[PDB]
UniProtKB/Swiss-Prot annotation, chains A, C:
Ubiquitous. Residues 40-44 are annotated as: Leucine-rich region. The N-terminus is required for dimer formation, association with RFXANK and RFXAP, assembly of the RFX complex, and for binding of this complex to its X box target site in the MHC-II promoter. The C-terminus mediates cooperative binding between the RFX complex and NF-Y. Belongs to the RFX family. This is DNA-binding protein RFX5. It is found in: Nucleus. The chain holds residues 24 to 90 of 616 of the full protein. Homodimer. The RFX heterotetrameric complex consists of 2 molecules of RFX5 and one each of RFXAP and RFX-B/RFXANK; with each subunit representing a separate complementation group. Interacts (via PxLPxI/L motif) with RFXANK (via ankyrin repeats); the interaction is direct. RFX forms cooperative DNA binding complexes with X2BP and CBF/NF-Y. RFX associates with CIITA to form an active transcriptional complex. Residues 3-68 are annotated as: N-terminal domain. Activates transcription from class II MHC promoters. Recognizes X-boxes. Mediates cooperative binding between RFX and NF-Y. RFX binds the X1 box of MHC-II promoters. It is linked to MHC class II deficiency 3: An autosomal recessive disorder characterized by immunodeficiency and recurrent bacterial, viral, fungal and parasitic infections from birth, usually affecting the respiratory and gastrointestinal tract. Most patients die in infancy or early childhood. MHC class II deficiency 5: An autosomal recessive disorder characterized by a defect in constitutive and inducible surface expression of MHC class II molecules on B cells, monocytes, and activated T cells. Affected individuals may present in infancy with infections and hypogammaglobulinemia, but the disease course is mostly benign and patients do not develop severe infections. Some individuals may be asymptomatic. Phosphorylated. It comes from Homo sapiens (Human).
UniProtKB/Swiss-Prot annotation, chain B:
Disulfide bonds: none annotated. The C-terminal domain is necessary for the RFX complex formation. It is linked to MHC class II deficiency 4: An autosomal recessive disorder characterized by immunodeficiency, failure to thrive, and recurrent bacterial, viral, fungal and parasitic infections from birth, usually affecting the respiratory and gastrointestinal tract. Patients may die in infancy or early childhood. Phosphorylated. The gene is RFXAP. Residues 4-60 are annotated as: C-terminal domain. It is found in: Nucleus. This is Regulatory factor X-associated protein. Part of the RFX complex that binds to the X-box of MHC II promoters. It comes from Homo sapiens.
């Protein structure tokens, strides 16, 4: 399965690997291959409870006093 | 555990590396749907912010 | 390398693509293979070797502002 000189963190620390950069580019073209908004709604359409705590309706006023 | 508050980079300038990296960060576990939309959304708001550049050559005080 | 498959947007609009999901997990594990923090800085905060700004790129209106 090929060789692997030096540590991984170091082997890469010196400089990004071509293979890595390649994969990255692929993903970019993947998502870009199709619209974002269009797919956004299309995906959500699937059954997975889109509610999610009513869009996270957590409390949060402020709470801060300093006078008397 | 969380990285200290170090001011350096900024939410802008979309790039391949910054993509895979920032993606994983938001991924958390391994959600392709989220990392996908989020990645795109981030890139959008990224370009929006950060206005044009200028000269800015002050010279006062010590 | 033969056959006549459908489009990506189409096959996707009807249902998520196995390649898309699988791929995502592929790269995700690739980076996870090593420290996520140590690399996060070495990457997002790369030292930038001898590039001199892409040989003095000097940007202007490539991508920063336009409209909306």
């Amino acid at each position: 399965g090929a060789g692997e000189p030096t540590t991984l963190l170091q082997r890469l620390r010196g400089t990004i690997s071509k293979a890595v950069q390649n994969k990255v580019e692929g993903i970019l073209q993947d998502v870009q291959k199709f619209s974002d908004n269009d797919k956004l709604y299309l995906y959500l359409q699937l059954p997975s409870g889109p509610t999610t705590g009513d869009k996270s309706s957590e409390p949060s006023t402020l709470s801060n006093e300093e006078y008397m | 555990g969380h990285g200290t508050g170090s001011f350096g980079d900024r939410p802008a300038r979309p790039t391949l590396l910054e993509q895979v990296l920032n993606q994983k960060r938001l991924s958390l576990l391994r959600s392709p749907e989220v990392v996908q939309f989020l990645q795109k959304q981030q890139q959008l708001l990224n370009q929006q912010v950060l206005e044009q550049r200028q000269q800015q050559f002050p010279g006062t005080s010590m």
